[PDB]
Amino acid sequence: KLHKEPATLIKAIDGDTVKLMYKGQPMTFRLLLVDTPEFNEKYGPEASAFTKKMVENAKKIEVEFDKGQRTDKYGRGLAYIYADGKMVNEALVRQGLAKVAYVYKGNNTHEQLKRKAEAQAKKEKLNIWSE
């Protein structure tokens, strides 16, 4: 019931935002269901680096909207972002560089996938969970 749509990287921004060209227009995308620390914070630089490498190295970036709101109050696109078929959102959580967060009803299709990744990152005491 969700579909992957094409996009191209404009520029990495931080752990959980990225600038993409979508349907030919520049847009800042905020990754659904996750929260990375701010660049100024602990693991913030590492979250930024992780996402940056992931999208910069991708041959193919895809955007997948959920069933609900597609833009937030700041005009940012809200999507699951994939790099060569791998979801950036889930990968950050799996590596402990993001927490599952901002789970609003109707835009939560991938919630359970994320929660499973967080549990495994927490079990492995990775990054954020190494405290």
Which residue precedes each gap in the chain (C to N above 2.5 Å)?
Answer: none
Are 9 and 55 within 8 A, CB to CB? yes
Q: Does 41 bind ligand THP (CB under 6 A)?
A: no
Q: Quote the CA–CA distance of 122 and 86 in Å, as a whole number.
A: 21
Name the residue among 126, 127, 101 with its Cα closest to residue 31: 101
Q: Mask 57-76, x = binds ligand THP (CB under 6 A)?
A: ---------------xx---
Among Ca ion, ligand THP, none, partner that 105 touches (CB below 5 to 8 angstroms by kind)? none
Q: Quote the CA–CA distance of 37 and 15 in Å, as a whole number.
A: 7
Instruction: State which of residues 21, 28, 35, 113 lies at the interface with ligand THP (CB under 6 A).
Output: 35
**Please, which residue, 35 or 64, has the CB nearer to Ca ion?**
35
Q: Does 88 bind ligand THP (CB under 6 A)?
A: no
Query: Of 47-86, which residues contact Ca ion (CB under 5 A)?
Result: none
Among Ca ion, ligand THP, none, partner that 72 touches (CB below 5 to 8 angstroms by kind)? ligand THP
The reply to whether 16 sits in an annotated binding site is yes
Q: Which of 38, 46, 64, 111 is catalytic?
A: 38
Are 64 and 3 within 8 A, CB to CB? yes
Are 58 and 95 within 8 A, CB to CB? no
Where does this chain bind Ca ion (CB under 5 A)?
Answer: 16, 35-36
The catalytic site residues sit at 30, 38, 76
